[PDB]
Amino acid sequence: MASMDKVFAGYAARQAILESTETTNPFAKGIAWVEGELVPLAEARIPLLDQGFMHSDLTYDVPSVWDGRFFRLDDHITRLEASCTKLRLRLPLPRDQVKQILVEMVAKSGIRDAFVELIVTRGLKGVRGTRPEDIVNNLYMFVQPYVWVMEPDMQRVGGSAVVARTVRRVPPGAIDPTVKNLQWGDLVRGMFEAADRGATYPFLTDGDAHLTEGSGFNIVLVKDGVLYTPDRGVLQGVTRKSVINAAEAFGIEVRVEFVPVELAYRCDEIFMCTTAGGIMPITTLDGMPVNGGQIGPITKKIWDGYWAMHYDAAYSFEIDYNERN
Amino acid sequence: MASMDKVFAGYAARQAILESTETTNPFAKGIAWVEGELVPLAEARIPLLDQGFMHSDLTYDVPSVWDGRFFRLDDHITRLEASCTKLRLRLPLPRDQVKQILVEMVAKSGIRDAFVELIVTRGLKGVRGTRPEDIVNNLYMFVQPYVWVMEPDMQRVGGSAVVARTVRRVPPGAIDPTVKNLQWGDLVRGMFEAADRGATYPFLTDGDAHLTEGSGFNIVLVKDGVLYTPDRGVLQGVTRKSVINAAEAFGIEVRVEFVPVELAYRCDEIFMCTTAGGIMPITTLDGMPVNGGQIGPITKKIWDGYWAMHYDAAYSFEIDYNERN
Ligand SMILES: Cc1ncc(COP(=O)(O)O)c(CN[C@H](CCC(=O)O)C(=O)O)c1O
Ligand SMILES: Cc1ncc(COP(=O)(O)O)c(CN[C@H](CCC(=O)O)C(=O)O)c1O
Ligand SMILES: [Ca+2]
Ligand SMILES: [Cl-]
Ligand SMILES: [Cl-]
Ligand SMILES: [Cl-]
Ligand SMILES: [Cl-]
Ligand SMILES: [Cl-]
Ligand SMILES: [Cl-]
Ligand SMILES: [Cl-]
Ligand SMILES: [Cl-]
Ligand SMILES: [Cl-]
Ligand SMILES: [Cl-]
């Protein structure tokens, strides 16, 4: 219930070092792997005919680095492989080589707090009209400075959400939300709706009176000392997984189940969770304060627990930035 | 009711001529417009950070050229602008300039039968966390040899379809299907399902016992001299529009309305329609011959009518090759 000052101050200090190197290190603003070559992220290009662009025929995943430590990298690569399997894709390199490249990329960038993305696409030939044996999947990877879906200043007070009414989440029988994907048509609609309504974060329903997820995050409700989070219709987030780990360590019950929309209007606390920002409190919903409008005690406990895990060998490992090896 | 021989023979003759130019015209296999530069299609590259790739945050449209005549180009540009408006995008160049560039591209390629695609993306900055004033949309365009969703020799016989059971169409309240888009998660699932079931084409339902569309085409049923095609849940196809034009000219009623799945099992004829292939008969459905399994008389009449429209000044214009239209 009190790690924010230190977590954010550490980040600010590391950030200041990174920023100072932007004119000397061409990778300080990010680095990409394309067709076996490493290039500054702003200069990275992909073939126009890649079906990842032509029909968003891809999956992706986003591990992260915090304070020079990769967080749950194996979980993210395993989820990527699972997503590939569901799409009949195959990770184009052995996963141990992939890990080695990522660590090399991070080390070269000098970035201590990083957003790391891997993308596997169908390749230069589409599914339609192609012999399955002629299909060759493509891999793209990049590392960039850590991305905040909720900035540190706002995490201190909580953000503003709406339950979206002009859009609902793509259902699993159309697109499987457990397959991480970049088909964000509904999520972008949600972001526009939130903004139109004077808020920031959209919570999308399943179009059947139950909650799913938002534009880049899972949703957790807190009521009478219990956490509630949607089971079906959502990405099985690694942050959400970490929230469950922390809750279990603290003796807090977590129910991963169908969550009726009505619970969002009568719960004690709300937070979002995602790799790109961590634990993100929501203190206004549909223009109304959430139970008084302050960040709640269980949210604070989970917040602290989540960041503590980033230093636990069971969930993280230290990257060697030395040059080299 | 028999224009197939002449239409396909003409195409074959033009294909042979096109092929003979490939060793001397670097654009004969296709040409792309990227950031104001014209490049061979295979060499075209886009920024990795373009949000058209990063979150498929884009719309697109696909006019075509047949026998050196652009087909309904104005309709396609108008639909593109409509799609852009619905996504809060804006065509980055005046539409008259866009048409001029397209004609120039086709002429340089020397392609007489062409698939032409325009893509408008959100640009290098995403909706999330960006000042709306800081967003600059991007334009990509390319011309390639005509693409067949059903090959000419399969159109002579008819194709096999299934009503998909493992996937349904993304509903409009999640992603608006009247906005042409490349978020094909459900459509690719449909293609895999069709293949798994020994058929070529998937027909997707609305997940509520009514038909919508398939993987790159609209669906038309013929029953007792009347055409039926889904109103809601689908792209408002320009080919479908052309089918309606031809049918009205022929005195054939067309009902654009809710089409129950059951009608597909008791109708007299079925065909698919799309810019990438035209009029595409379906003669087996779920492994069962459609009303005897032969291409039907109304399908043939529409087939002929559709291709005749490609030479009709009301619907087309001739491109001036080596001099621009
Ligand atoms: C739809 C969706 N649901 C849930 C999550 C949370 O899952 P995890 O805890 O495994 O991260 C994400 C993460 N999406 C953000 C990217 C969003 C952006 O950059 O705008 C991420 O990959 O972290 C997401 O995109
Ligand atoms: C989902 C969908 N519905 C209907 C249609 C028919 O609409 P129109 O008659 O306006 O073309 C298309 C055409 N999409 C094809 C896909 C091409 C491909 O798969 O390679 C196109 O863009 O021409 C489509 O993609
Ligand atoms: Ca450390
Ligand atoms: Cl530190
Ligand atoms: Cl999974
Ligand atoms: Cl509301
Ligand atoms: Cl999805
Ligand atoms: Cl290791
Ligand atoms: Cl000819
Ligand atoms: Cl089209
Ligand atoms: Cl139109
Ligand atoms: Cl079935
Ligand atoms: Cl769609």
Residue numbers in the entry:
A (entry chain B), B (entry chain A): 1 to 325
Which passages does the manuscript contain on this structure?
The crystal structure of AT-ωTA was determined by X-ray crystallography at a resolution of 1.6 Å. The asymmetric unit contains two polypeptide chains which form a stable dimer with a contact surface of 2198 Å2 spanning 40 interface residues, which corresponds to 14.6% of the total surface area (PDBSum,). The electron density in the active site pocket is well defined and interpreted as two distinct states: (i) free Lys180 and Lys180 covalently bound to the pyridoxal-5′-phosphate (PLP) and (ii) N-({3-hydroxy-2-methyl-5-[(phosphonooxy)methyl]pyridin-4-yl}methyl)-D-glutamic acid (ligand code: PGD). We have selected the glutamic acid adduct, as it best illustrated the length of the observed density without complicating the final structure interpretation. The entrance cavity is capped by a flexible beta hairpin spanning 15 residues (121–136) thereby limiting the access to the active site. The small binding pocket is lined by the amino acids Val62, Phe115, Thr274, Thr275 and Ala276, which interact with the substrate. The large binding pocket is surrounded by the residues His55*, Tyr60, Phe115, Glu117, Arg128*, Leu182 and Trp184, (*indicates that the residues belongs to the other chain); thus, hydrophobic residues and an arginine residue as described for (S)-transaminases are present. In AT-ωTA, Glu213 takes this role by forming a hydrogen bond between its side chain carboxyl group and the nitrogen atom of the pyridine ring. Interestingly, the side chain is slightly kinked out of the active site to create room for the binding of the L-glutamate or alternatively acetophenone, as shown in the docking.
